[PDB]
Amino acid sequence: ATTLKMGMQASVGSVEYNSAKMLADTLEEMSQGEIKLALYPSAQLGDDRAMLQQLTLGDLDITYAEFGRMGLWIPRAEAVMLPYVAKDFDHLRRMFESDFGQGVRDEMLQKFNWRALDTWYNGTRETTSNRPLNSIEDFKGLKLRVPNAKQNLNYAKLSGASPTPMSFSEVYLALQTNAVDGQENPLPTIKTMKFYEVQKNLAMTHHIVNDQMVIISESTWQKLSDTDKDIIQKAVQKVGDAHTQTVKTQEAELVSFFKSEGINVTYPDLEPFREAMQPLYKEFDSNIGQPIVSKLAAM
């Protein structure tokens, strides 16, 4: 039998990790145990950049990574993680399957020995606030907590809010005291930190859509039998369907939980947001040398 090593920053009990175990179960079934999967969670081998280098060298067999995260090595890939470029996951999936996506996935393989087998939906960031946000006009003046990360800052800046960097442990009390007016995160994070206790409103801003690519080392892929390749390919697709459905289900359950706890959930029109991000798309189109963003948005 063969044992493949899979590493990830997520921890036990997470959806990424539960889907890795379902992949391990599925590989045991479809191979009669000829394939077994050993899981290294909690960034015990390093962060995604480190485990991606381990895939390049063949020291790690499989790992997760976002499509946009390739922008550190393949700069045009950052386009898909610019705010509001991806309208929903099926749009981000159509970008993954597009000529643009195939070209990135070709460059991943030929340069870095990363074979991307599939992409999975991993949730969407939404915005909570102490006052209702029914349109982009309400964002003016909003003290909005973002991580110190380029695109989350740009989302706050260009919607008209006042981006407020702050360490994650300090935010609950800052929302409680209204020192900060709101924050933006995935819905499971909002329940996890119990931000809903100190936030009366939740806007479905859908400003950032997240994916996980499932990447296997080409050095491992070349050593595998073509039967095993087919088993792995089919197992990843089967588990990705379930992973995407699990995330979509938990978001719907969390919105229903927030509505049951008295939270006002707003659904603003997002085309004003898309038009408000155009200065950031222009900065990207010009630095990348090709008008790419208008191209992904129209898919």
Partner: nanobody
């Protein structure tokens, strides 16, 4: 599901030795990382030791390293926590835990309530 059952426990003297056993019911034990937790009365749960299935790695909490030893017997589908040089600090309910496919044991402690299987613990009283 997986059924885990502990053996061993009871009263022991300070400085004494005790061996805990944990037998697993199915045929997933050879592909499961195994661990030992403990909860002393009134305190939080502490991950004590763990042992891998794939790369043989072990974990110990600093409070027991150098005087607990963990080991595995796949032929009997059993893990052992061998408590040498026991201290009153060690008095607690001890719990056996299993997690399939996980390769690295220290990660069991991060979200213990999500782990695959648990035994209903065994009390160890040190005098």
């Amino acid at each position: 599901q997986v059924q885990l059952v502990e053996s061993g426990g009871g009263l022991v003297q300070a400085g004494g030795s005790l061996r805990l056993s944990c037998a697993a019911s199915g045929r997933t034990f050879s592909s499961s990382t195994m661990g030992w937790f403990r909860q002393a009365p009134g305190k939080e749960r502490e991950f004590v030791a763990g042992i891998s299935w794939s790369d043989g790695s072990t974990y110990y909490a600093d409070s027991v390293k150098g005087r607990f030893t963990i080991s595995r017997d796949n032929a009997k589908n059993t893990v052992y926590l061998q408590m040498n040089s026991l201290k009153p600090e060690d008095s607690a309910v001890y719990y056996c835990a299993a997690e399939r496919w996980l390769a690295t044991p220290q990660a069991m402690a991060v979200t213990p309530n999500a782990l695959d299987a648990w035994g209903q613990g065994t009390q160890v009283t040190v005098s």
